[PDB]
Write a protein that binds this ligand. Structure first.
Ligand SMILES: [Mg+2]
Ligand SMILES: [Mg+2]
Ligand SMILES: [Mg+2]
Lengths: 222, 196, 233, 226, 125, 204, 195, 212, 195, 196
């Protein structure tokens, strides 16, 4: 019997800062125990200061990104070159996903950018289109390895102030872009050590008011 | 089924056994598996008898309508029409067909169309359940540009062995010779080919 | 939904300093029966692209007809059909990738794994993969089926990352490809000795080599191997 | 898992990677897959890790008793026969896939063993999920009359191919060399090409960060005198 | 297994092993039973050759088989424990299957049956 | 249906400078239903500590089995069993049930009384030994624990620093697992003193 | 069978068990007592597969009664619960396991404390202030989590139990025909004949 | 998941937890399970997250079209029936929903409709849906009165979700409260269950089984 | 849903239907009215698969109300029952059939006679003195076979109905939370608010 | 597998390919399928490698113990021992074995034991997946009382064709000659037999 779905591995991570947002992902593509590519880009600049990644089954992932990029193009045509805001993009992606409710895109989608007040924004989607604005979201193979670490080091969960013994929480102080990138790199380095589908390389797309910047880092190739 | 087609110096010859089975019961012991789709384009049928009879009837219709408009079709064209039906309806068909024909420009040609609906042009072809047992024999004994008498012997000996080992194959050996001279039918009985 | 009947095995390929190389054997298997021994599975499109196909042969012949039709169609009302508006490797791949994903989305796939190898207008090397699921990816080396498990490890020792491509000559690359084909003949039960090889170079163009054979094989050591454990004679 | 065995001039060498998995998760990054059956008979195991270890220790134990009973140094063919008959009896349910190598008074030997009980003989062998990557290297660089240095090089290169190309294999290369008329030399972590880079940040917490409900001393000592 | 016939007939029609078992009973401390109109009393002798005995923990001569039946004995002390254990198990088995405690006659018939069995079974005294 | 995730729970162990730490959650459940918040999963036989995750009936059975065996060991050997030796006994005992196994994930932690060397080890349900230098994880949130330990851990931590590291590893892993939590315990083990600390955590 | 509840208060353990027995289509009985006295100060209620429940309970009863006669001594609730757990843990890897879940309520005369043990058919034992088997806990635990105090009287325990049964009678689809309630304390075991 | 809604003197209280799981893995602790259909109507999320999100914001669009065409606020009866009729068309295809459509109009007063993906549409006073529904029902049934104050009703809804969050493994994270009046719904904050549990334990004296 | 009963006496038809609605584990409602008035002198009760029951009943109601307005005339109970049967007989060979069983109680004003029709989801129609769907008939028909008379008053019919419900409450495993009872006679349809 | 044994004037010769597969992967390309159970009684193995290696080891043990008590066993006796194991354990085995041996009294003999565990004495036998493709060739080319050189050619040509068509077969062609003169091993490489 023909199986229309597959699993290409991969792990992605989106974090929203005070006036910035990062969307990171490993560059390794796999089937079963084989490596297809050590560098296959998975996070994409979609225009209008929006970055996107659709992780899981790569064929569906490429199809969805392609259709969203197309949606941005036609939004400009139909609405006098108006900038597609991150919240409007998110609602639009819900409809692209739910349109195939009974034959779904087998992917976990994350988009990142800035909201209309210039503050960092990340949105997260399930395969059939349910979505949420979030501060912090890992997706894909090693999501379960990364999220608990982020709860602890970004949101300071289970951390209290010394001397008070559980009475006063550690205050939630804002993180810089340099600080966030450190946590992203350590997240993927740790995931690479313990998950066989994570490795080769890490590509990070950073979004500010100035635009979209890229950073690349080597990961272990075993 | 044991079917084959072999090109030779003067053209091409098709060969077949005459056994049709329903399980272990021989539903017809004198079947004609060599089928005419055009004057000098014939085919050998293997697989489901319903399917291959339905396909051959449609091809004969297509080539009759081709002839009325564009004149005599090539063997390649006949093979293409067979392929189109076999490829596009692969989910619903169980058919293995060998197409053989004689042109004056191209002379003798053989095309085999297996289950999937692919086409393969070959100097000779074998098919059917009985063909498995004569891959060795045919590969060792086939030569290009044989005479009519040599090719008749090659097919007679080959199908003799296929019949001997395959329970699904048997009866008489039928043959059809395609040359410039015309169309000749041959038949060989058990008492002849069993003693070879 | 179907099942593959007549099938072709591995297609292997890699990039080198001035272009790309691709190779595939000439066999059409019918299960374990090695039925058809003269099947060409590398199909050139123009003088800048070679498409290598594995899997179902009936579907391969269909794709071959689509590519032939693509060349015809591109020439229609196109004065620059043999110049600026000729078919690029990237155009040919994207078209095939579209077809493959559409067919899997109707639950009626073309049961193939395809590698498109070529050189673009600006001299850039093109090498990308697509299969029955519509999955696509690129790499300095690419291989299908068994090739993915046995050829890639050998070819990756020559070009391990992007920066190794300018350091790799056409002689070193071809040598690596030919050795990989030998290894596949040793170890893949659905392979043959006869194969085809194509080189697409930005300077010397398309070189298509037919009727190549696996040679320099090691078998002599077999004479000393006796029994399965304790047997001495 | 990637494991190989290579014959050479005056002996035999076996090698293995050091990654053990539970699905897609790496359970141990520095696993020991080279097992000792006897001082100069070593084997490497792929498949169910408990089985390869258990079957090696059982046969190793019985080989030791046999060696004491007969006053002779153990033979590789004895380990092979005992391993295959044990595995055949259990009809493949004991999931052990082994490459058995060693030196004895008869000479140097190299065998492989499938979980169902079938054995084979060879000058070069590979097993595990990375066996195809390893065998590609072996089929490309193996020749007759290899030296000790050449065989170690070829064996580790074959494991590296598994490490880099097979997701089931990774980390380090372990080697064991068994030469005729010499002690077997076990080279643990012969290659270490996968050390983790320094992290960007220290995650040492301030003391008192964790909220505590109760503290108590645990009595690990026995009942006291007086 | 050890199958030797230890209890056998002699020419005069006596089974000596059974008769010698009675001689062990003759040696045991005296036990007496008396039933009144609405009670039964069991009296037992304790030989005073053993002082410095701890009477709290020393095995008592009368044993409860169930809450309504008791058993006393004369003879080998170790042997009596085996009969007492078997009787206690049978008492609970009877309650479990019949849903009624044993009658005194039934419990007696069981213990007596065990004793008889050990007079014509191989390998036992 | 899957026996290893009916009851839920986790165990983690770590090494430090002249010390070891072992910790576990306190939940026992019947799938979605939380049944007990006092189900401790760490036991000790002399100075050797054993954590066990998985099917709770087997957790209890194996504790009773190893108490049985380590008591007979002590009577015959006239000394307490060591971590290295006990590790082999756990492995042997699990493999004897090769084709009808206990559905558990044991973890051993302790300091050798003669060499002073810190020791930890982990097992699969059928006896395979994982003897890591750094840390061992087990249970329904083992993925989460691997993620925490791999980033938070550094070698040669002092006892009171190791406490903070292992506590934060457990807590944050448990909070990303539905079947773990409802309280937690941490053992800090030195050559001749062991401190036990109950942690305050969310009760959902 | 269906609903069995338990609650340990200051000085006693209270067990409540449904009265219905249903053979598929019909309710064959509405006065069934799903409990057995193991010893004067230990009571066990049970629920699970038909036949196996009573067979297991009576088997345990026979064994504890045998121990009591042999030693002239009542085992502690903890000791009885351990014996029962081992029997079920043995049973789960048998040819045909006992499909039986139990609650053991006992008053320990040595420690002068009530004790409640919950054991399922796998041999999973926990000591609890209050417990249940099946779906009973899904309806009642939120009420017990709110109102329970360790210093409750027997009368307050019965009142909290009434609130639990009322919630069961409201939200459960099955008619379990009320409950038989029994109290275990220092004076032994007694049945509340009006509930 | 645990979601509830109940009618009382002062209108409707809606209370939900915040947890989403994929098997044993906790995907999110910050899920918004109350869908703000419009300023006057609320819907709860249980079953399929997407099915509930998608079709209840769609419902908001249909309600907006109704009031543009009819120049009048849509009734809760009419709003709930648009949704139930829609999902009934899809019956068999595999939609998963269990939701409470909540509103307060002039003609109806406070109204709650339970709408289901099998096509069920039930009017009622108290509804509770999700894996922790039985736990929340217990607290609700034993403390519910029509004459509850807005303050006490808000607490009852908060306390009932806490009960479910404690016992049900697949419920937790935080509690979201809403109060629906005739002039629209009013949001009454996000309450972390971790902090809320200890606060309620101390102040109320409940959860004596838990050490704090 | 669950239990629906009907009885035709001298001068009226009485329909009794359970109040419970159960979503698997919990009873979501205990006051549900499983009936629709099709016309002033015709009532239909229903039971079957969730959603489909109300959807079918309201669809029938809309159609009969449409007929009533178009012709300014009330269809006879026989005519309404035939229309309903055809809809279900059409439905059973559809892509997704209505899984709904109904009772139709009506008073024919032309013949001055009460009439009760029983129709299952297949479109199987019978006219009866008394009827039921599901397991309801298994418990109640032996009582109705004994006590029923064609000349019974409405009060005697209600009393015989009480005896039927009492037997259901005794022997049925499910708690159906009592019944809503409605009477159909020459004056129309009314609900008995104390039962 | 492609295996065969052929009696001739001076005795018997066994032949085999050297390929062992796990699916499409060639797990061993230089396998020895010709196995010694006694000095001049050998066998060809096909089917499960575990099963046929286990059977051959037991037979070798049985014939070694037979020899110590009763002297050299006959080829018929060796075939009987093989049969007993294959027949009595037919539910749990997948083994197709050809037994070939040389006596001085009986000379060259060949016995084939297919899946069910039946025994068939034949002038020559073919087995394995590759044998299907050479039933025709072998039947046409086999003669009784051939010379050593003729029999080597017959086996070389036959297995060449079996290898050519069967993907499961390949590598080198191994042969073992059994005569009064002794035991001779032969090996033929691809470059030799592919050009035939
Ligand atoms: Mg690797
Ligand atoms: Mg025949
Ligand atoms: Mg919870």
């Amino acid at each position: 019997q023909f199986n229309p779905y597959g699993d290409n591995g991969g792990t992605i991570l989106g974090i929203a800062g005070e006036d910035f947002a990062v969307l990171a992902g490993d560059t390794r593509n796999i089937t079963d125990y084989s490596i297809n590519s050590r560098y296959e880009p998975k996070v994409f600049d979609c225009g209008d200061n929006i970055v996107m990644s659709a992780n899981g089954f790569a064929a569906d992932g490429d199809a969805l990104v392609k259709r969203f990029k197309n949606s941005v193009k036609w939004y400009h045509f139909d609405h006098n070159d108006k900038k597609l805001s991150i919240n409007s993009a998110a609602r639009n992606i819900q409809h692209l996903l739910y349109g195939k409710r009974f034959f779904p895109y087998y992917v976990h989608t994350i988009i990142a950018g800035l909201d209309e007040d210039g503050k960092g924004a990340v949105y997260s989607f399930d395969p059939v289109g349910s979505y949420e604005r979030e501060q912090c979201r890992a997706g894909g193979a090693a999501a379960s390895l990364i999220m608990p670490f982020l709860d602890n080091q970004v949101n300071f969960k289970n951390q209290y102030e010394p001397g008070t013994n559980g009475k006063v929480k550690k205050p939630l102080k804002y993180l810089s872009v340099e600080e966030v990138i450190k946590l992203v790199r350590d997240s993927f380095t740790s995931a690479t050590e313990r998950h066989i589908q994570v490795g080769d390389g890490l590509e990070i797309l950073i979004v500010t008011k100035d635009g979209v910047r890229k950073e690349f880092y080597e990961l272990k190739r075993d | 089924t044991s079917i084959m087609a072999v090109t030779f110096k003067d053209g091409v010859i098709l060969g077949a056994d005459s056994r049709t089975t329903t399980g272990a019961y021989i539903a017809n012991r004198v079947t004609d598996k060599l089928t005419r789709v055009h004057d000098k384009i014939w085919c050998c049928r293997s697989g489901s008898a319903a399917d291959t009879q339905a396909i051959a009837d449609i091809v004969q219709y297509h080539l009759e309508l081709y002839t009325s408009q564009y004149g005599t079709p090539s063997t390649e064209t006949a093979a293409s029409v067979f392929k189109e039906l076999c490829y596009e309806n692969k989910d619903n068909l169980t058919a293995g067909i060998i197409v053989a024909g004689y042109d004056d420009k191209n002379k003798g040609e053989v095309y085999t169309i297996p289950l999937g609906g692919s086409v393969h042009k070959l100097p000779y072809a074998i098919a059917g359940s009985g063909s498995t047992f004569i891959y060795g024999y045919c590969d060792k004994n086939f030569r290009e540009n044989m005479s009519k008498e040599e090719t008749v012997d090659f097919i007679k000996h080959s199908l003799s062995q296929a019949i001997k080992w395959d329970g699904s194959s048997g009866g008489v050996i039928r043959m059809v010779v395609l040359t410039a001279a015309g169309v000749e039918r041959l038949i060989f009985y058990p008492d002849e080919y069993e003693q070879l | 939904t179907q099942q593959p009947i007549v099938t072709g095995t591995s297609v292997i390929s890699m990039k080198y300093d001035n272009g790309v190389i691709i190779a595939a054997d000439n066999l059409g298997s019918y299960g374990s029966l090695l039925r058809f021994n003269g099947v060409e599975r590398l199909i050139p499109v123009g003088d800048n692209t070679v498409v290598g196909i594995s899997g179902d042969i009936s579907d391969m012949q269909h794709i071959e007809r689509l590519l032939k039709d693509l060349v015809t169609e591109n020439a229609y009302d196109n004065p620059l059909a043999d110049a600026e508006e000729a078919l690029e490797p990237s155009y040919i791949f994207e078209y095939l990738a579209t077809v493959m994903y559409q067919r899997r989305s109707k639950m009626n796939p073309l049961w193939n794994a395809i590698i498109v190898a070529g050189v673009q207008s600006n001299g850039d090397q093109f090498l990308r993969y697509v299969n029955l699921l519509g999955v696509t990816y690129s790499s300095p080396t690419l291989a299908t089926g068994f090739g993915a498990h046995m050829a890639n490890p050998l070819l990756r020792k020559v070009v391990d990352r992007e920066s190794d491509i300018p350091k790799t000559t056409v002689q070193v690359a071809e040598e690596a490809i030919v050795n990989a084909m030998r290894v596949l003949y040793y170890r893949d039960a659905r392979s043959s000795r006869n194969f085809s090889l194509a080189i697409i170079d930005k300077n010397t163009g398309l070189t298509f080599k037919k009727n190549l054979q696996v040679e320099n094989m090691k078998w002599d050591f077999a004479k000393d191997i006796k029994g399965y454990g304790t047997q001495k004679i | 898992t990637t494991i190989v065995g290579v014959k050479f001039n005056n002996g035999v060498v076996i090698a293995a990677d050091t990654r053990s998995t539970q699905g897609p998760i790496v359970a141990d990054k520095n696993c020991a897959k080279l097992h000792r059956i006897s001082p100069k008979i070593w084997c490497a195991g792929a498949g169910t890790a408990a089985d390869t270890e258990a079957v090696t220790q059982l046969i190793g134990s019985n080989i030791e008793l046999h060696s004491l009973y007969t006053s002779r140094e153990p033979r590789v063919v004895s380990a092979l026969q005992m391993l295959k008959q044990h595995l055949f009896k259990y009809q493949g349910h004991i999931g052990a896939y082994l490459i058995v190598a060693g030196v004895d008074p008869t000479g140097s030997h190299l065998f492989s063993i499938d979980a169902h009980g079938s054995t084979d003989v060879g000058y070069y062998l590979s097993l595990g999920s990375g066996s195809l990557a390893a065998m590609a290297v072996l089929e490309s660089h193996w020749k007759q009359d290899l030296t000790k240095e050449e065989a170690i090089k070829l064996a580790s290169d074959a494991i590296q191919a598994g490490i880099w190309n097979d997701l089931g294999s990774g980390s380090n290369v372990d080697v064991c060399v068994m030469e005729i008329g010499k002690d077997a030399e076990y080279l643990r972590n012969y290659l270490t090409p996968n050390v983790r880079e320094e992290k960007q940040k220290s995650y040492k917490f301030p003391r008192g960060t964790t909220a505590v409900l109760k503290e108590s001393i645990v009595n690990i000592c026995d009942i006291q005198e007086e | 297994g050890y199958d030797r016939a230890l209890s056998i007939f002699s020419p005069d029609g006596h089974i000596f092993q059974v008769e010698y078992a009675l001689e062990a009973v003759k040696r045991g401390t005296c036990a007496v039973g008396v039933k009144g109109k609405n009670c039964v009393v069991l009296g037992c002798e304790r030989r005073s050759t053993l002082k410095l005995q701890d009477t709290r923990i020393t095995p008592s001569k009368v044993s409860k088989i169930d809450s309504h039946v008791v058993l006393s004995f004369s003879g080998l002390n170790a042997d009596s424990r085996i009969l007492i254990e078997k009787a206690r198990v049978e008492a609970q088995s009877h309650r479990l299957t019949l849903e009624d405690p044993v009658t005194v006659e039934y419990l007696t018939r069981y213990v007596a049956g065990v004793q008889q069995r050990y007079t014509q079974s191989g390998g036992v005294r | 249906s899957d026996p290893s995730s009916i009851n839920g729970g986790i165990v983690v162990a770590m090494t430090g400078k002249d010390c070891v730490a072992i910790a576990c959650d306190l939940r026992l459940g019947s799938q979605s239903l939380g049944v007990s918040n006092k189900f401790e999963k760490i036991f000790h036989y002399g100075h050797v500590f054993l954590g066990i995750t998985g099917l709770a009936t087997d957790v209890t059975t194996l504790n009773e089995m190893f108490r049985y065996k380590t008591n007979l060991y002590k009577l015959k050997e006239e000394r307490a069993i060591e971590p290295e030796t006990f590790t082999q006994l756990v492995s042997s005992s699990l493999y004897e049930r090769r084709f009808g196994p206990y559905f558990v994930g044991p973890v051993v932690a302790g300091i050798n009384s003669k060499s002073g060397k810190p020791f930890i080890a982990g097992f699969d349900l059928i006896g395979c030994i994982d003897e890591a230098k750094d840390f061992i994880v087990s249970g329904t949130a083992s993925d989460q624990l691997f993620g925490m330990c791999e980033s938070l851990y550094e070698p040669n931590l002092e006892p009171e620093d190791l406490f903070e590291t292992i506590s934060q590893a457990l807590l944050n892993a448990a909070d990303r697992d539905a079947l773990s939590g409802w309280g937690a315990v941490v053992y800090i083990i030195k050559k001749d003193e062991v401190v036990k600390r109950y942690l305050k955590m969310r009760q959902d | 069978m269906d609903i069995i509840l338990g609650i340990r208060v200051q000085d006693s353990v209270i067990l409540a068990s449904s009265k219905a027995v249903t053979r598929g289509i019909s309710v064959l009985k509405d006065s069934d007592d799903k409990t057995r006295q193991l010893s004067p100060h230990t009571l066990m209620s049970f629920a699970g597969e038909a036949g196996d429940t009573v067979q297991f309970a009576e088997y345990i009863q026979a064994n504890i009664q045998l121990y009591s006669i042999r030693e002239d001594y009542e085992l502690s609730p903890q000791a009885v619960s351990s014996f029962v757990r081992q029997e079920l843990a043995k049973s789960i890897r048998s040819r045909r396991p006992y499909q039986v879940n139990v609650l053991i309520g006992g008053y320990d005369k040595k420690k002068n404390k009530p004790e409640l043990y919950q054991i399922d058919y796998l041999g999973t034992k926990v000591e609890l202030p209050y417990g249940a088997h099946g779906y009973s806990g899904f309806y009642t635990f939120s009420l017990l989590d709110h109102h329970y105090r360790p210093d409750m009287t027997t009368e307050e325990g019965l009142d909290l139990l009434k609130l639990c049964v009322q919630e069961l009678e409201k939200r459960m689809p099955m008619d379990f025909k009320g409950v038989i309630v029994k109290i275990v304390d220092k004076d032994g075991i007694r049945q509340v004949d009006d509930f | 998941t645990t979601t509830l809604a109940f009618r009382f003197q002062g209108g409707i209280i809606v209370a939900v937890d915040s947890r989403a799981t994929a098997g044993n893995w906790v995907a999110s602790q910050t899920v918004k399970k109350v869908i703000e259909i419009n300023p006057f109507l609320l819907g709860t999320m249980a079953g399929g997250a997407a099915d509930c999100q998608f079709w209840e914001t769609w419902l908001g669009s249909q309600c907006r079209l109704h009031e543009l065409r009819e120049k009048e606020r849509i009734s809760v009866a009419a709003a709930s029936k648009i949704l139930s009729n829609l999902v009934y068309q899809y019956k068999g295809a595999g939609l998963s929903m269990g939701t409470m459509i909540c509103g307060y109009t002039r003609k109806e007063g406070p109204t709650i409709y339970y709408v289901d993906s099998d096509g069920t549409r039930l009017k009622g006073d108290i509804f509770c849906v999700g894996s922790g529904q039985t736990f929340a029902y217990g607290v609700l049934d034993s403390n519910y009165k029509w004459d509850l104050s807005v303050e006490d009703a808000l607490y009852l809804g908060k306390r009932s979700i806490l009960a479910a969050a404690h016992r049900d493994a697949y419920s937790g994270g935080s509690v979201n409260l809403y109060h629906v009046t005739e002039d629209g719904w009013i949001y009454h904050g996000n309450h972390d269950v971790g902090e809320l549990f200890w606060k309620v334990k101390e102040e109320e004296g409940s959860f004596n089984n838990v050490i704090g």
